[PDB]
Structure formats: structure tokens, C-alpha cells
Amino acid sequence: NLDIIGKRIEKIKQEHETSWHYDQDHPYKTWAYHGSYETSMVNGVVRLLTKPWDIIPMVTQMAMTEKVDTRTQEPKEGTKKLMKITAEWLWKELGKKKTPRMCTREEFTRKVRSNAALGAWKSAREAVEDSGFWELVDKERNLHLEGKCETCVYNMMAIWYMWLGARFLEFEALGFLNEDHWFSRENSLSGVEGEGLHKLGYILRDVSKKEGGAMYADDTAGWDTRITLEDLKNEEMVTNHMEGEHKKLAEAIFKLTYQNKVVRVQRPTTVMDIISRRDQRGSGQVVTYGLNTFTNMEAQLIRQMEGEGVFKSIQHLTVTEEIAVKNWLVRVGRERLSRMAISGDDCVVKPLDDRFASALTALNDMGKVRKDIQQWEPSRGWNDWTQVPFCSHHFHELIMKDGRVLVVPCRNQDELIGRARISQGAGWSLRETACLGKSYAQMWSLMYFHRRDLRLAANAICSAVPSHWVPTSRATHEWMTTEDMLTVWNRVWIQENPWMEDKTPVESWEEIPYLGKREDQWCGSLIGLTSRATWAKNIQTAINQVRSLIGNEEYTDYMPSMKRFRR
Ligand SMILES: COc1ccccc1-c1nnco1
Ligand SMILES: COc1ccccc1-c1nnco1
Ligand SMILES: [Cl-]
Ligand SMILES: [Zn+2]
Ligand SMILES: [Zn+2]
């Protein structure tokens, strides 16, 4: 404990030896407390082209603006045995066609020169060019090999930002989980890593085709706060598939950063509290998505075991039950994984039958308490895959004029328009703001083409931003391109779509269908309102307002792609 965190604490104390004090009025009960020292904007391009939404509070309010300090109990021995056996088996299946390996300074740099979230000289782009930086990384690296840590400290402020060296060492040991697609559907059977929002609907419809009960989609209440040290230890078992230096490097990240956290927090009363804890996910973990998917996969298989009566009690797992659990995993494990879609803490399960709905003992004792339902109330499942929520979306089964079947993602249009009106960060030029507006417009044309208001606004934004300006943004992002959007649509929805047998390209946007008008209004369309009919009729005037602001550039008119504007 203090042997593992003291060095980190000792170093921070010394760097602020003039302001250190063991404050007696600290709000921490479940976080160990050590001491203290002394210490959204609106996108105008999108907003000017979505004027009807200026008076919709669900849109406008999105742009305005005690669970971490909690303690989950040690699971019963029967639960701990259920997890350990499932986790050992799960790492084995994930590793059958994948090779754990170290990630490199070289591939780590290709991310810093591509402006990706690293959780980190002025910027990360500077420090990587300097060899003095890497001389410090080696200091720490060598420390980790000697079972010690000095500078890997989390900074509470959405992400816990670290010194660039700690973000590499984490990427070095565990990045393979991310970049080698361990949670791909092909590899993990439950996962959807890299699948893309145009595949999730088809994936849920394939789960629907299985024989069984309702589809269950129970959200966990603060998943990250509910991660036990037993979960963290089952996650560490990935090191059993590793070797040499990699194994030592990964074991250290697990032992010294994950299973013992050190965090520097702000407190207005403004001191920097230095707190520590062994459990929870926290933030700061670059493989949070992957390890959440892993632990959720494990929890959901055990819940499936409980519904099938593979075991009677969580209090003590009997050895006859132990072999039965192992025999279940080996004979039907893969079949039960294929009955799920799991994205981090998010899941959809189509179990063998509806006993799953009241199989709650293991799930509650693992600490994965369901959101907004009494602890022992049975889960309410969905009878129709087109109603199940997943990754903040639902999915419509749309029919093209020619009988081919699109499965399309959808959410409340107020949520889509409200997010596109927001920019994160400072120092945006007009040109940068317009290129972000164009990324949203191209995303809408690819994913939400079936919503009347989003096709029209997306065409208006692409008409209002210079044709050749590149979309920017500080799973799959096929809208991030200057290629023609009809061509990308044909690639994504027809050519590369493994659920479409007939590969005949579409030759115009008018051959690409909308939802029914009533279904469009149900999902938030303003089609039918006077404000929307004025907006639509006078759209060239809004486009010209934004063209005048940006100035004398090469623009294309995309509105004639819509039949009504086509003269
Ligand atoms: C956005 O992801 C990251 C990228 C880099 C470093 C950390 C994270 C992270 N931490 N917790 C969740 O993510
Ligand atoms: C699979 O997710 C990632 C891929 C790449 C980089 C970071 C992440 C991540 N961040 N927090 C969780 O995962
Ligand atoms: Cl339903
Ligand atoms: Zn360290
Ligand atoms: Zn919808």
C-alpha cells in the first residue's frame, strides 16, 4: 500500500515543501487522504443553419452549464469463484487468435501527430520530438521493472490527465487491447469494437434471430464506481498470456497504477488534496473501454448461468458446480457470448428464456446494481429489437424503393442538433468552426439520411462551407473525408455492407429513403410546423448568410440533390 504509493506521495510533498499540511477538515471517507499544497461554446455555422431549433429548450439548454466517494462490498466466495473461472476462460477465448504484444514509441507518436486523446513542453506534439522526454520515460520504465513507481499520478478535474511518459507506459503494456481489436465482434463474439454505428442495428437484428426470451438492456448505476478490486484482479489475468518484459511491464501498470491509484484533486475551501484508493475504475485508464467490455461480458455470462440454474447459490460455489460451470463455458460459452452486444458498460442480452429477468443474486453481489429499478424487482425486457436502446441509439428497419433493407441508427433529433451546435475548446477560427460543422453535416448524411430535417440541414451546411475545406474534429468515421458523400454512402451501405446481397450502386440521393413521416415526428422531426416550412422554403437565404460571413470562396449548391429544391 504505502510502499507502492509512498514514493509518488514523497516526491509531490518535496516539490511543494513550503505549503504541505495534513488538513483535518477533508471530505474523504472512502478515499485515503494524504495532504495538500497551494494552487462548451456554440458552433455559429451550425446554429445559423438550424434556426427553428433556437426556440426548442431541449436543443438550447444542452449548450448551457458524491458517487466516486462510495464503497462496494467484497463479493461472497461463491461469486468470486464464478468470476475467476469465467475470467480465466474469457481471456483464453479472446487470446485464441490474438498475440499480446508491446506497443511502440513509433506507433504512439503516429497518434500524437494525428491529434488523438492521449490524456496528456506546451502540447504532447512537442515532448515526443524531444529525446530528453524519453530519458525520463526510461527512468520510470526501469522503475516499473523494479516493481516501483514515481511519476504515474492521476489529476482529477472527464479524463484524469497524466505526464506524457505515463500515458506511453500504459499504451506500451495494454494498447494492444485497443489497436489489435481484442473486442471486435469477430474475435470476442459479444463485442462491437470498430463495428461502426451503421453496423450496430444489423448486429442487434442478428441477436434477435436467435431462439430465446426478451432482449434485456439493463444499465448499471455508475459502472466505473462499482468496479471491485476482485474485478481489477480478474482483469490483470490478461498478463498470464504475455511474456518477457511485456509481462513485467503490464503487471506493473495493473499493480501500481490500476490496483493502487494516486490522485491530485481540486478543493475550493483551492488546495490540491493527494488522495489514494485501490478499487473503482476511476478515470485515467486508456483501456477503460476494453476492460469494461471484458468485465461486463463476464458479469452477463454469469447472470446467464444463474438464469439457466448452472449454480444454485452465490454464498459458496461447490466443486461439482465448479466443474459444471467450466463444462457450460466449454460447451455453450461461445454460443452465449453470441447472444450479446456489449460496448463497455453498455449491453443487450437475448438469453435462452425469461428466467434471466429475475436472476439477480450474482449481478447484485458483484456490485453491478441496475439503474432506476428496485434491487430485487425483475428486469423488464423488450419484445422488438427496433425498441431496444444501445450506445444511445435505437434502430429502424427501413425498406428502399427497390426492396433492399437498410437497418439505420436513430435517436431523438433534439439530441443530434444540440450536440452539433456545441464546440469544445478555445481559439477556433471561423474556418475551423465551419470544418467542424461540416463533419457533423457529413455524419448526418451518412448515418441519419432517413431524418428529413437532418438531410436538409446537412445539405445546407455542405452548401454553406467551401466545397474543398476538410472536415475536422478535436468506432468508424467514414464521414471524415472530402470524397463525394453519395460515393461514401454507396461504399458503406451497399459495397462493404455484408447484410446486402445485391451490390447495385444507388445513382442519386432521391433513391435513398426517409422514415415514415409519423415515425420521423415521433423521433423529434419538426416536419409539419410553420417554423420548419419557412426554414426549408428560404434555406438558400440562410446558406447565403453563412457564405457572406466566411467570404469569397468556392461553394457548391447541394440543395438540388433534394427533389423539392431540384427546381
Ligand atoms: C478518452 O480515453 C483516453 C485517452 C487517453 C488517456 C486516457 C483515456 C481515458 N481514461 N478514461 C477513459 O478514457
Ligand atoms: C477502445 O478505446 C480506446 C481506443 C483508443 C484509445 C483509447 C481508448 C479508450 N479510452 N478509454 C477507454 O478506451
Ligand atoms: Cl418492446
Ligand atoms: Zn509509474
Ligand atoms: Zn427513431
Is 318 close to ligand 2, i.e. is its CB under 6 Å away? no
H or E element: which one contains 311?
none
What is the Cα–Cα distance from 188 to 206, expressed in whole angstroms?
Answer: 16
What is the Cα–Cα distance from 486 to 512, expressed in whole angstroms?
Answer: 10
DSSP type of residue 16: T
Atom 10 (ligand 2): residue with closest C-alpha?
286
Residues ending a continuous segment of the chain before a break (C–N > 2.5 Å): 39, 65, 120, 157, 269, 474
Experimental method: X-ray
All structural domains of the chain: 1-38+102-179+228-279 (3.30.70.2840), 78-97+186-224+287-386 (no CATH), 394-561 (no CATH)
DSSP type of residue 73: P
User: Are 265 and 161 contacting, i.e. CB atoms less than 8 angstroms apart?
Assistant: no
- Closest by CA to 475, choosing from 160, 111, 113, 200, is 200
Give the ligand at the shortest distance from the Cα of 516: 5
> Position 69: which residue type?
D
β partners of residue 32: 276
**What is the distance in A from the centroid of ligand 3 to the CA of 301?**
23
Residue 380: Cβ-neighbour burial (10 angstroms; 0-12, 13-18, 19+): exposed
**C-alpha 234, offset from chain centre:** 21
H or E element: which one contains 407?
strand 405-410
DSSP type of residue 54: G
What is the grid cell recorded at 230? 476482485
Is 286 close to ligand 1, i.e. is its CB under 6 Å away? yes
Which of 289, 294, 295, 476 to mutate to test ligand 2, by most ligand atoms within 8 A of the CB atom? 289
> Position 156: which residue type?
M
What is the Cα–Cα distance from 477 to 482, expressed in whole angstroms?
Answer: 12
Give the ligand at the shortest distance from the Cα of 216: 3
Residue 59: partners with Cβ closer than 8 Å, 6 or more residues away: 50, 53, 414, 417, 418, 421
What is the grid cell recorded at 292? 469494461
Residue 244: Cβ-neighbour burial (10 angstroms; 0-12, 13-18, 19+): exposed
Return the residue matching grid coordinates 450479446.
Answer: 340
**Residues within the annotated binding site for Mg(2+)?**
219-220, 345-346
Question: Residue 50 in 3-state DSSP?
Answer: coil
* CA gyration radius, the chain: 26
Three-class DSSP labels, 360-392: CHHHHHCCCCECCCCCCCCCCCECCCCCCCECC
Question: Residue 39 in 3-state DSSP?
Answer: coil
Is 288 close to ligand 2, i.e. is its CB under 6 Å away? yes
Quickly count: other Cβ atoms within 10 Å of residue 415's Cβ. 15
Distances in Å between the alpha carbon of 416 and those of 46, 90, 473, 486?
Answer: 12, 36, 16, 21
**What is the distance in A from the centroid of ligand 4 to the CA of 69?**
24
H or E element: which one contains 52?
none
Is 286 close to ligand 2, i.e. is its CB under 6 Å away? yes
Which of 112, 115, 286, 293 to mutate to test ligand 1, by most ligand atoms within 8 A of the CB atom? 286
What is the grid cell recorded at 259? 490496483
DSSP type of residue 417: H
Return the residue matching grid coordinates 477503460.
Answer: 288
Per-residue b/e over 125-162, b at no fewer than 16 CB within 10 Å? eebbeeeebbebbeebbebbeeeebbbbbbbbeebbbb
Question: Residue 396 in 3-state DSSP?
Answer: strand
What does the angle CA 502 – CA 507 – CA 510 come to, to the nearest 5 degrees? 105
**C-alpha 471, offset from chain centre:** 22
What is the Cα–Cα distance from 196 to 29, expressed in whole angstroms?
Answer: 42
